[PDB]
């Protein structure tokens, strides 16, 4: 069942991460130990070498794309705008996460102005939670009743994937298989 | 075959919502880009946003709050509500398709349904 | 932003004639640009797509090129239809933005 979250086309952006529901089905993981060798199989919780003698009922499979220097900040209790407005992880995480560079499937010589990520935002979010709304967030005294201006800003900005870049600013490809 | 009918009714009244809605007569959302077009006299064809199977999107900068289009992931009563309606909005609207032989890339407008109508008194 | 000012606009023809298009860009679109159909009554067409390449479904004679500036398409069959206007297409800058077109007569 490890096709479609590995092997796509299209990934979506860190404010509208993806959320697959995997059950019901073997899920033997010969892949994982031959996916090499620009794989970084970072687990935390349990061996890598331990999985075949476990089992688990719900297999989420998270996906986006993120800079190099933003996939430290998907460790547990972490601090940092990719892990406090757009995805957070609990101090209690049992799971795994593998990161591997992308240049060459999303990235284009004009530049790939797709991939959005909040900004700013008045309040940190609680494990697991989706944030979909887009609506104007107000900083400022005078309240704008959904009306543009100063102090009313549109909480959403693109990234600026490029393949002439250095490593850090590369897209990185992230995928977390936390389990329930 | 994949007919992308459009069943919301609803004209506008000056300055209120629009109460439009697409539909899908076969062929499965899956991941594919649908998007909104309009054309008018004045201003002729434009692109409004675009969805995926979750709320991933990008909307057009001329006019950007008002428009918000949202994801129907299986109903596919996926909209294209708006607010603010004006006098000039009058126009016939479309609703667009992509093709699915390339990457992350809303850009070869393929599949296309009948328009419909909006006006003001 | 990104403008097109797709010229000529006056033409007349009859069936198997000569044919004859450009497109005007402004900055630089690579190989990103479009070419769509549209007869009058009727929900629009993609013709052409990547620059260089036609789309499925087009018949044999409908091909263009393009650098931002010198864009050619070379067709001179008009069969008893596609007298209707054709569409200029580009997206690389966000947003992006089609053309007005122009038509031929009997």
């Known amino acids: 069942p490890f096709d479609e979250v590995f092997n796509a086309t299209r990934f979506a952006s860190v404010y509208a991460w993806n959320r697959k529901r995997i059950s019901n089905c073997v899920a033997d993981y010969s892949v994982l130990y031959n996916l090499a060798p620009f794989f970084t199989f970072k687990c935390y919780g349990v061996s890598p070498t331990k999985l075949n003698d476990l089992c688990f009922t719900n297999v989420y499979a998270d996906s986006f794309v993120i800079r190099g220097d933003e996939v430290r900040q998907i460790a547990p209790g972490q601090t940092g705008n990719i892990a406090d407005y757009n995805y957070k992880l609990p101090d209690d995480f049992t799971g795994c996460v593998i990161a591997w560079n992308s240049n060459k499937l999303d990235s284009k010589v004009s530049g790939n102005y797709n991939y959005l990520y909040r900004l700013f935002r008045k309040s940190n979010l609680k494990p697991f939670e989706r944030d979909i709304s887009t609506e104007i967030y107000q900083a400022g005294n005078k309240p704008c009743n959904g009306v543009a201006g100063f102090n009313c800003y549109f909480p959403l900005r693109s990234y600026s994937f490029r393949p002439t870049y250095g490593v850090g600013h590369q897209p990185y490809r992230v995928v977390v298989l936390s389990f329930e | 075959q994949v007919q992308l009918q459009e069943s919301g009714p609803g004209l506008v009244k000056p300055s209120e919502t629009l109460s439009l809605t697409c539909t899908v007569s076969g062929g499965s959302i899956s991941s594919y880009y649908w998007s909104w077009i309009r054309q008018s006299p004045g201003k002729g064809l434009e692109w409004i946003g675009y969805?995926?199977?979750?709320?991933?999107?990008n909307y057009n900068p001329s006019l950007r709050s008002r428009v918000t289009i949202s994801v129907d992931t299986s109903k596919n009563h996926f909209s294209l509500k708006l607010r603010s309606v004006t006098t000039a909005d009058t126009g016939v609207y479309y609703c667009?398709?992509?093709?699915?032989?390339?990457?992350?890339?809303?850009?070869?407008?393929?599949?296309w349904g009948q328009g419909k109508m909006v006006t003001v008194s | 932003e990104i403008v097109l000012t797709q010229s000529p606009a006056t033409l007349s023809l009859s069936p198997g004639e000569r044919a004859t298009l450009s497109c005007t860009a402004s900055?630089?679109?690579?190989?990103?640009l479009a070419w769509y159909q549209q007869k009058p009554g009727q929900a629009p067409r993609l013709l052409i797509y990547?620059?260089?390449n036609r789309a499925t479904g087009i018949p044999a004679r409908f091909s263009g090129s393009g650098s931002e500036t010198d864009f050619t398409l070379t067709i001179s069959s008009l069969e008893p239809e596609d007298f209707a206007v054709y569409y200029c297409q580009q997206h690389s800058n966000w947003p992006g933005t089609f053309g007005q077109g122009t038509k031929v007569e009997i």
């Open positions: 990547g620059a260089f």
């Open positions: 969805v995926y199977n979750s709320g991933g999107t």
């Open positions: 667009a398709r992509d093709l699915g032989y390339s990457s992350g890339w809303p850009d070869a407008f393929d599949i």
């Open positions: 900055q630089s679109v690579f190989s990103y």
